[PDB]
Write an enzyme that holds these catalytic residues in place. Structure first.
Site, mmCIF file in Angstrom:
data_model
loop_
_atom_site.group_PDB
_atom_site.id
_atom_site.type_symbol
_atom_site.label_atom_id
_atom_site.label_comp_id
_atom_site.label_asym_id
_atom_site.label_seq_id
_atom_site.Cartn_x
_atom_site.Cartn_y
_atom_site.Cartn_z
ATOM 1 N N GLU A 173 0.371 5.228 -7.802
ATOM 2 C CA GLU A 173 0.076 5.986 -7.404
ATOM 3 C C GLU A 173 2.136 6.866 -7.402
ATOM 4 O O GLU A 173 2.644 6.189 -8.530
ATOM 5 C CB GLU A 173 0.302 5.364 -5.679
ATOM 6 N N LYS A 228 -6.773 -8.056 -4.164
ATOM 7 C CA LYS A 228 -7.325 -7.238 -4.309
ATOM 8 C C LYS A 228 -8.094 -9.295 -5.092
ATOM 9 O O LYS A 228 -7.003 -9.490 -5.147
ATOM 10 C CB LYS A 228 -7.082 -6.836 -5.441
ATOM 11 N N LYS A 269 0.668 -1.215 0.460
ATOM 12 C CA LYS A 269 -0.067 0.371 0.116
ATOM 13 C C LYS A 269 1.074 0.975 0.335
ATOM 14 O O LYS A 269 1.192 1.608 1.170
ATOM 15 C CB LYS A 269 -0.937 0.376 1.346
#
Length: 535
Positions: free
Chosen positions: A291, A391, A239
Site C-alpha cells: 500500500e 490473514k 489496514k
DNA sequence: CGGGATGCGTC
DNA sequence: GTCGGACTG
DNA sequence: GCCAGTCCGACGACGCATCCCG
C-alpha cells in the site's frame, strides 16, 4: 484472410444474443466453447467478449454519446435524454437510428470484427468532440442498427449478457481463467493456448513484469467468523487507508500496478526507484504487494485518504509518499505464490531492510486466540485507524481470490450513522431503470431555514422493497417528508454537499425508520457535531 | 480566458 | 470501496 | 430445503484532467 463468417459482427452479435438469452453460466460458457471450436479469429472474439475486463478508455458516456449522435442524426437531443431514463444508451441509439430520414442504417451487416477493433482503437485516441462525431459517423454509416447498438455496448464496457471473465475464459481452456489471474494479459494467454492446441494430431504461472490479479480481503463480520476461517491462527496487519500498489522490478526497470491493474500515476511512485534497491540488496527481480501512502514526515503519522492527490500532496511541507510492503509474490526469478504466508513474511524480513519513511514492513502481530484478537479490534478502533486485515498463517498467495479478512468498526453489530431525510430522486440504469434507484439524502437546517444536502444513496434496499418504494414517495419531477437511517465507513468533508461540506464514505442504508418523520431526523448543527467526535 | 460539463480512477 | 441477487456443486 | 465460494451488475464521495463554448 479476415473474410470468413466467424469474423462478422452478425455472428458476434449472434454469440452475444445467445449467451444473454441463456441464464445458466454452465451453458453460457458451453455456447462460446462450441463457437470457438466448430463455427475465425480467436484473440478478438474473446477480447471483444470482454469489454469490461480488457478496458479501453473512450472518454464517452451516456451524456456525450447522445450529444454527438443527435448531431449526426439531425434530431432533437431532448427526446434522447428522456429515452435515457429507461437506462440503456445502446437501445436509445438504435431506436433513434431509423428515425433519421437523413442518416439511414446500412442495408446489410458487412463489418468484420477486425474493423470494429481497429475502429475502437482509433476512437480511443480521440478526445475532441469534432473528431469523435466524425469517427462515430465513419463507422455508424456501416451499421444494421443491430450493429450500431452492439458497438456502443462495446464502447460502454458492458455487453449486458451476464458473462464476465470467468465464464468467457472457461470456454478457452480448463485453466485460462486461473492462468489469466496469475499473469493478467489476454493476448499472452491466447498465444499460449494456441501454441498448446497446436501440437496434438496450460500451466498457471506468474510472469515477471506482467500484472498479477491482486489477492483480496473478505468482509468479516465477527471474531467468531475470523476464528473459523483461520484455523491455523492469523497475522493481523493494520489496514492502510491508501492505494494498493503491486511493484514489479526487473534489473532496474520498475513498474507499478494499481488495484485495477492500471499503471500507478507516476507522481506517487516516481521516487521509489531510488529506495527499493537499497531496501532490497541483491534482489534483481521481484514482485511485491503493498500500500502507498503519504506520510507526515515530521510526526510519523499517515495522512487521510484524499491526501494522495497531486495538489493535495503539494499542500504539505512535511511529507513525501511511502510504501508499506505487506507481501512478496516473486523474487529473483522464482515465484512464491505457493509458499504459505508465514514462509513469505519470513523471506521479506530475511531480505528487506526498512528504509525510514519510504519503504516499510507492514506491522503484523501473530494472533491465535479469540480474546487476543477482539482486544486488537478495540485497541485499533480507538485512534480511528481504519481497521484490520487478517490473514491465515499457512495461506498461500491466491490471485484474485477473496481469502484474506478485513475488519472495520461498521461491520461488527458501532457504525457512524445518520437518520436522514429523503428529498430527491434519480433514474437507475439497466436492470434497475425507469425507476427511482438512487436517492438524495439530506437534513433540515434551522439556519437559513432551508433544506440541506449530505449524500446520495442507492444501496441498502432489496428488489421487492424498491418496487414498493415506487409508490410511497412524493414526486419531485423538476430536473432543470420521508426519513431513512444511512450508514457509512466515516463522514467526509468537501466543498460539494451543501451541509457545511460533509458527506458519507460508502453510504449505505440499513434501517427504514417508520418513527421519526422529519423533525427528529438530523439537522445541520447536530451533524456538524457528529462529524467532530471522530477526531 | 476562465466557468461549466463531462469523464476517469482511487477507495 | 458498497450492496443485492443470482448459478454451481 | 440448506449451505459457502464466487461471480455479476448497479451504485456512492472524493480528487482530479481535459474540452467546451460563451
Amino acid at each position: 484472410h479476415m473474410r470468413h463468417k466467424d469474423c462478422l459482427l452478425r455472428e458476434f452479435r449472434k454469440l452475444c444474443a445467445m449467451v444473454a438469452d441463456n441464464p445458466s453460466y454452465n451453458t453460457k460458457t458451453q455456447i462460446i466453447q462450441d463457437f470457438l471450436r466448430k463455427g475465425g479469429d480467436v484473440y478478438l472474439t474473446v477480447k471483444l467478449l470482454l469489454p469490461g475486463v480488457i478496458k479501453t478508455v473512450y472518454n464517452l458516456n451516456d451524456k456525450q454519446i447522445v450529444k454527438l449522435f443527435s448531431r449526426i442524426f439531425n434530431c432533437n437531443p431532448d427526446d434522447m435524454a428522456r429515452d435515457l431514463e429507461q437506462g440503456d444508451v445502446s437501445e436509445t441509439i438504435r431506436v433513434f437510428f431509423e428515425q433519421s430520414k437523413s442518416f439511414p442504417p446500412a442495408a446489410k451487416s458487412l463489418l468484420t470484427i477486425q474493423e470494429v477493433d481497429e475502429f475502437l482503437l482509433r476512437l480511443s485516441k480521440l478526445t475532441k468532440e469534432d473528431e469523435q462525431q466524425q469517427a462515430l459517423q465513419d463507422i455508424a454509416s456501416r451499421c444494421t442498427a443491430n450493429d450500431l447498438k452492439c458497438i456502443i455496448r462495446l464502447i460502454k464496457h458492458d455487453l449486458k449478457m451476464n458473462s464476465g471473465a470467468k465464464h468467457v475464459l472457461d470456454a478457452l481452456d480448463p485453466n485460462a481463467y486461473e492462468a489469466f489471474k496469475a499473469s493478467r494479459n489476454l493476448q499472452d494467454v491466447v498465444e499460449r493456448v494456441l501454441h498448446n492446441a497446436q501440437e496434438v494430431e496450460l500451466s498457471v504461472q506468474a510472469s515477471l513484469m506482467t500484472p498479477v490479479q491482486p489477492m483480496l480481503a473478505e468482509a468479516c463480520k465477527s471474531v467468531e467468523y475470523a476464528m473459523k476461517k483461520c484455523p491455523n491462527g492469523m497475522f493481523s496487519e493494520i489496514k492502510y487507508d491508501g492505494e494498493r500498489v503491486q511493484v514489479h522490478k526487473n534489473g532496474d526497470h520498475f513498474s507499478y500496478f494499481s488495484r485495477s491493474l492500471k499503471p500507478v500515476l507516476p507522481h506517487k511512485v516516481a521516487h521509489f526507484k531510488d529506495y527499493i534497491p537499497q531496501a532490497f540488496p541483491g534482489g534483481h527481480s521481484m514482485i511485491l504487494d503493498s500500500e502507498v501512502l503519504l506520510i507526515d514526515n515530521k510526526t510519523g503519522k499517515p495522512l487521510p485518504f484524499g491526501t494522495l492527490g497531486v495538489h493535495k500532496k503539494a499542500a504539505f511541507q512535511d511529507a513525501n509518499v511511502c510504501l508499506f510492503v505487506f507481501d512478496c509474490i516473486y523474487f529473483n526469478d522464482v515465484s512464491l505464490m505457493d509458499r504459505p504466508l508465514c514462509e513469505r513474511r519470513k523471506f521479506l524480513h530475511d531480505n528487506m531492510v526498512e528504509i525510514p519513511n519510504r519503504i516499510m514492513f507492514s506491522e503484523m502481530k501473530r494472533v491465535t486466540k479469540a480474546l487476543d484478537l477482539a482486544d486488537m479490534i478495540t485497541r485499533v478502533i480507538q485512534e480511528g485507524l481504519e481497521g484490520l486485515v487478517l490473514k491465515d498463517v499457512k495461506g498461500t498467495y491466491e490471485p484474485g481470490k477473496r481469502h484474506w479478512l478485513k475488519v472495520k468498526k461498521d461491520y461488527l453489530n458501532m457504525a457512524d450513522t445518520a437518520d436522514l431525510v429523503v428529498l430527491g430522486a434519480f433514474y437507475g440504469q439497466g436492470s434497475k431503470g425507469g425507476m427511482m434507484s438512487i436517492f438524495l439524502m439530506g437534513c433540515y437546517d434551522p439556519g437559513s431555514q432551508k433544506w440541506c444536502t449530505v449524500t446520495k444513496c442507492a444501496g441498502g434496499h432489496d428488489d421487492a422493497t424498491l418496487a414498493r418504494l415506487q409508490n410511497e414517495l412524493d414526486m419531485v419531477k423538476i430536473s432543470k417528508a420521508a426519513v431513512w437511517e444511512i450508514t457509512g465507513a466515516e463522514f467526509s468533508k468537501s466543498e460539494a454537499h451543501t451541509a457545511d461540506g460533509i458527506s458519507i464514505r460508502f453510504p449505505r442504508c440499513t434501517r427504514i425508520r417508520d418513527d421519526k418523520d422529519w423533525k427528529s431526523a438530523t439537522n445541520l448543527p447536530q451533524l456538524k457535531e457528529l462529524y467532530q467526535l471522530s477526531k
